[PDB]
Each structure stands twice: as structure tokens, then as C-alpha cells.
């Protein structure tokens, strides 16, 4: 099978920038076809045969490319071009689809609002504790979100969420769910949220003691 | 005008069989072929196969050669996809489309399918207390973390909708238990808080479980 990447794999672009995304083939093909899903939508025909834009497509969409390397470019980005664009060849058997490049609107760095939130009574009488980290309006997506449990660094008992672009102010916000057993949980005392991203000048850390904060016990 | 209906969503246990449909309308269904799409969140799109139904000629992707199913109906203007010997791997988003010829740029709204041994539970509300350790300087972050249902969607609103400013919700994630979990949080004005309540409404119904917290300053 023809391999289809798409580089980048997610990019943000500013409004009125000029914007390229690439298709690559792991083998010669003669055309390319392109479609755009928007989030919670189906994919629809962007562009076919490289540089045919579909019908309702507006004229700042423009595709080009030959042989092992193709490419879709908007000549000026809007906010309404914020979508996943999918590459697709049926040059060779079976047909294929590139794996995305996930357009989203840059704007200024904006640091975010770090919460740490305790287990409640309630999770522990059930026999496990949930500690929930947050992120709060934040941008870009990138952040890097560390559980220190005891200056114990925690690995594969978390799970981050993160929601999509706003579509006001365009940030992201993120949950890092730490998950305990509760006989594990009070066996330690102190538990850190350490948080590093671009709009922080230093990481910022939200941590508490089991037992700074009232419970049932 | 060009309209591709699918059928609603399916759940089904492994190793069972589903069937889904795609119902053309506003264009003629013989004169295109009917291809089929398989898409997983944090996966690109998969090609099946396609069917002619014209003449019920069919093509398949190797890799669900032994997976898929495509049938077609001239008189209902109807494709269908069977799905056989269910494995979790199977859970996706489904789309019909007639790919091929061009002419046509519209796919079907998708059909979402979870296979999974798990049973129909609803889920526990537990307060994102509200203290120094969610305070700022003056702003304040609480929440409802939604925890332990099956299957989607949960639906959770705060003081019965009209609380709506700063309010997130994060998309569920699918625990290694089989059971979805989320959390759903607003930030408010710390001032605030010892005065006016805050209660979250959490909805799963296919438990029919609705709860309703209220999420209170907690001191540390
Ligand atoms: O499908 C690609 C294009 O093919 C043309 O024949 C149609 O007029 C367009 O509506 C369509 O976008």
C-alpha cells in the first residue's frame, strides 16, 4: 500500500497568514484529492485531481504537487479554515488517506490558571482517590504536566483531557487526573501538580499536604 | 438536497455481528459507487471498500476482507455494511460515501459503533472542592468530576443551565476499566463563593441516573 504523511502533523496559523501543509507518497502517484473535516462533522471533498477545488470551496484554497509530494495551501488563513485536512490517492490499490494535518488558529501565548483539587470524602469512602490537576485557558496546547507524590515523579497513573479550541478566545484546557487506590493515596503526604509551559517565566506548582485540608479523616 | 442518511449508533458485546445502512437520496444511487470509511479518534481515516450498486460488484480493503460486509438495495437506495466477529478494535466512527465518480462531495452524517463486555452503569459525582489550593487571586475554580458510566454520553450542566460562563467540560475518556470518565469545571469569582451556591447536573441516561452535587468551599 501506498503510505500517505502529512506534515504537519498540527499546525496553528495567525489570520491573514499564508499557510502550506504537505502530502507525501512512499510511492509516485498522479493526483491528489484533499478533504476537510471540521470537529463533530464528516469529511467533506476539498480539493480533487491536486488543484480542482470543489464546488463552494472559496478561491484563497489552492493545491499543487507531483509525484511523491503534494501540497494545500491557503493564500491568506480565516478563522473558518480551522479544520483537519485529509490527503487521499487511488493511483494504486487499495485507496488511502493520509493521517491529518489538524489546522488550528494561533494566537498570542497566554499562561494558565493552575488548580489542584483534592480527593472528595465521598471517592474515599469508595476505596479510590482521585487527584485532578487543571489547566485553565491556556495557549499553545503544549504544556508539560508532572505528578510529584513525595517527590516520587508518577508515571502511568494519570490521564490527561484536553478540550478544544475555544471558540472565543481560542485557548485550551487541560485535566490531569492523577488515580489512586485509597490505601496507596494515605501513604503518602504530599501531593504536587508541577506545571511547565511557555507562558509560565518559571513552572508553576500546586501541591497540598494529605491533611492540610479537612476530611473525614 | 443530497442526502446520505446512516443509522443510528450501535453498541454491541465482542464477538457479536452488527449491521448498519445508508440511505441515498437526491442523487441517482446506481450511478455511483457507495465507498465505506473507518475512522477511530487518534487514528486518520481507513479505507474498506466500496460497492457498485448497479451491479453489486464489491471491493475490499485486505485488511477487512474478512470484517466487512457490503450489501446495496437499488429499490430502497439503501448500501449496508456488516460487521462481523466484534473486537474492541472494531469501535469507530463509520462513513458512507459515494467517492467515485466525482460529482458528489457530501458523506453520510457517520455511524458510531462501541463493542464492549461492559454493563450499562451509572456514573458517581464527586465535588471539585473550591479552596486556596483552586484560588488565584480573585477568581476561584470548582467542578464535578463524573466518574465510572457506561456507555456515552454523560451531559452535566451547572445551577440547572444558568451558570453557563467560564464553564468546561472535557471530552470522556475511556478507562482501562471499560467505564468513561470526565470532569466538568467553572471558575467563578472567589468572593463568591461562601455566598452563592454552585450544584452541577450530571445526566447519563442510559443508566437513567441523574444527580445533582452541590460543590462547596472546602477549607485547607
Ligand atoms: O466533485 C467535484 C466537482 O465535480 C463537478 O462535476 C461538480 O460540478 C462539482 O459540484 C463538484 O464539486
Known amino acids: 500500500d501506498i503510505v500517505l504523511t502529512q506534515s504537519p502533523a498540527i499546525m496553528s496559523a495567525s489570520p491573514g497568514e499564508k499557510v502550506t501543509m504537505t502530502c507525501s507518497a512512499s510511492?509516485?502517484?498522479?493526483?491528489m484529492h484533499w478533504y476537510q473535516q471540521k470537529s463533530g462533522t464528516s469529511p467533506k471533498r476539498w480539493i480533487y485531481?491536486?488543484?480542482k477545488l470543489a464546488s463552494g470551496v472559496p478561491a484563497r484554497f489552492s493545491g499543487s504537487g507531483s509525484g511523491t509530494s503534494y501540497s494545500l495551501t491557503i493564500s491568506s488563513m480565516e478563522a473558518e479554515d480551522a479544520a483537519t485536512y485529509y490527503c487521499?490517492?487511488?493511483?494504486?490499490?487499495?485507496?488511502?488517506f493520509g493521517a491529518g494535518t489538524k489546522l488550528e488558529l494561533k494566537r498570542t501565548v497566554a499562561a494558565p490558571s493552575v488548580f489542584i483539587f483534592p480527593p472528595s470524602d465521598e471517592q474515599l469512602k469508595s476505596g479510590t482517590a482521585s487527584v485532578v490537576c487543571l489547566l485553565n485557558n491556556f495557549y499553545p496546547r503544549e504544556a508539560k504536566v508532572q505528578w510529584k507524590v513525595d517527590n516520587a515523579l508518577q508515571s502511568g497513573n494519570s490521564q490527561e483531557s484536553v478540550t478544544e479550541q475555544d471558540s472565543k478566545d481560542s485557548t485550551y484546557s487541560l485535566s490531569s487526573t492523577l488515580t489512586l487506590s485509597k490505601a496507596d493515596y494515605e501513604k503518602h503526604k504530599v501531593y504536587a501538580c508541577e506545571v511547565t509551559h511557555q507562558g509560565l517565566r518559571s513552572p508553576v506548582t500546586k501541591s497540598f499536604n494529605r491533611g492540610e485540608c479537612a476530611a473525614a479523616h | 438536497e443530497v442526502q446520505l442518511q446512516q443509522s443510528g449508533a450501535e453498541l454491541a458485546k465482542p464477538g457479536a455481528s452488527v449491521k448498519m445502512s445508508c440511505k441515498a437520496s437526491?442523487?441517482?444511487?446506481?450511478?455511483?459507487?457507495m465507498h465505506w470509511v473507518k475512522q477511530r479518534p487518534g487514528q486518520g481515516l481507513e479505507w474498506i471498500g466500496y460497492?457498485?450498486?448497479?451491479?453489486?460488484?464489491?471491493e475490499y480493503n485486505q485488511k477487512f476482507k474478512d470484517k466487512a460486509t457490503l450489501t446495496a438495495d437499488k429499490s430502497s437506495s439503501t448500501a449496508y455494511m456488516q460487521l462481523s466477529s466484534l473486537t474492541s478494535e472494531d469501535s469507530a466512527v463509520y462513513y458512507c460515501?459515494?467517492?467515485?465518480?466525482?460529482?458528489?462531495?457530501?458523506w453520510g452524517q457517520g455511524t458510531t459503533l462501541t463493542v464492549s463486555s461492559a454493563s450499562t452503569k451509572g456514573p458517581s459525582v464527586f465535588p471539585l472542592a473550591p479552596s486556596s489550593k483552586s484560588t488565584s487571586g480573585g477568581t476561584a475554580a470548582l467542578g464535578c468530576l463524573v466518574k465510572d458510566y457506561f456507555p456515552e454520553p454523560v451531559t452535566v450542566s451547572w445551577n440547572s443551565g444558568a451558570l453557563t460562563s467560564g464553564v468546561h467540560t472535557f471530552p470522556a475518556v475511556l478507562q482501562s476499566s471499560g467505564l468513561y470518565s470526565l470532569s466538568s469545571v467553572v471558575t467563578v469569582p472567589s468572593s463568591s463563593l461562601g455566598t452563592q451556591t454552585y450544584i452541577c447536573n450530571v445526566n447519563h441516561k442510559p443508566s437513567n441516573t441523574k444527580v445533582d452535587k452541590k460543590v462547596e468551599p472546602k477549607s485547607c
Open positions: 460515501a459515494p467517492l467515485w465518480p466525482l460529482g458528489t462531495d457530501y
Open positions: 437526491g442523487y441517482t444511487f446506481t450511478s455511483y459507487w
Open positions: 460497492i457498485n450498486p448497479s451491479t453489486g460488484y464489491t
Open positions: 510511492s509516485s502517484v498522479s493526483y
Open positions: 485531481d491536486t488543484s
Open positions: 487521499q490517492q487511488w493511483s494504486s490499490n487499495p485507496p488511502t
